[PDB]
Structure 1
Amino acid sequence: KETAAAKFERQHMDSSTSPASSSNYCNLMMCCRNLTKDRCKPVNTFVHESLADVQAVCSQKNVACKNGQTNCYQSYSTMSITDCRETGSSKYPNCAYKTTQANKHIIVACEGNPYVPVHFDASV
């Protein structure tokens, strides 16, 4: 008769392998979104909220962009994001990244009609 301990392991345990762990999210994603084809993009943030909520930021808190422009906007709320940045040993075409999941406000630059995000400026 299965023990209570083994029933729990059966119903609930699925330890991830190294290839499947979140720490490898950035390495897979920077590659599949084509951000490592020509050189290693040093830093890049992925945003996990809906597209509606991210597009909505273009009508939220207007802030200066790092480059000096003023078509940047910060979300009023924090958003689930994942920050990818090159590890010290990363070397093109073998780019490597440290994955950091977080909840932060995002700052995006907006342009066009409709006025939507066209550049990711910072997470704060």
Structure 2
Amino acid sequence: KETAAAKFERQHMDSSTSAASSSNYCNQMMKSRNLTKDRCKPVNTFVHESLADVQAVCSQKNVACKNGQTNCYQSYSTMSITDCRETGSSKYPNCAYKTTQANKHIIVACEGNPYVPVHFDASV
């Protein structure tokens, strides 16, 4: 019974490093966050900012989510993030990922009391 908010943290927060420093980051991180247990999660973004900075996005620029709901928010500023996407050859359970480090806005869906990120929608 992971809360939605806890699952967001597990899948998307990496406040421990300022940036991915190697092309192996995603392989490493997708494994360790247990995102390849039953299947290779195809796409996943990690954010290298404080939890407070990411939660704060729920008070920033209100936008529509990909799914048409309107509980999404875009960060006013760029954030250090790392995009992880499964390579075309990748085959469970030898999950393999392309790592791309970047500085982009994040868009998250927020829910609850407290009103916190529960879904990563996109980076811009």
The reply to whether TM is greater than 0.5 is: yes
Partner Cα separation in structure 2 for residue 5 and residue 36 of structure 1:
20
SS in 2 for 1:110: strand
The 1:89/1:52 distance shift into structure 2, 3 A limit, reads same
Tell me the matched-pair count.
Answer: 124
The 1:94/1:72 distance shift into structure 2, 3 A limit, reads same
CA displacement 1:26-75 (0-9 Å, x = unmatched)? 00100100111111111000000111100000000001000111100000
TM value normalised by structure 2? 0.83
Query: What are the ranges of 5 or more consecutive residues in structure 1 without an aligned counterpart?
Result: none
Query: What are the ranges of 5 or more consecutive residues in structure 2 without an aligned counterpart?
Result: none
Query: How far does residue 21 in structure 1 lie from its aligned partner after superposition?
Result: 6.3
- Shifted more, 57-66 versus 16-25: the winner is 16-25
**Runs of 4+ that moved beyond 6 A:** 1-21
Partner Cα separation in structure 1 for residue 25 and residue 98 of structure 2:
9
The 1:114/1:90 distance shift into structure 2, 3 A limit, reads same
Partner Cα separation in structure 2 for residue 14 and residue 73 of structure 1:
20
The 1:61/1:38 distance shift into structure 2, 3 A limit, reads same
SS in 2 for 1:23: coil
- Shifted more, 61-70 versus 14-23: the winner is 14-23
Matches within 5 A, 1:19-58: 22-58=22-58
**Larger Rg computed on CA atoms:** 1
> RMSD of the TM alignment (CA)?
14.1
TM value normalised by structure 1? 0.83
Partner Cα separation in structure 2 for residue 98 and residue 73 of structure 1:
26
Q: Share of identical aligned residues, percent?
A: 97
Query: How far does residue 19 in structure 1 lie from its aligned partner after superposition?
Result: 17
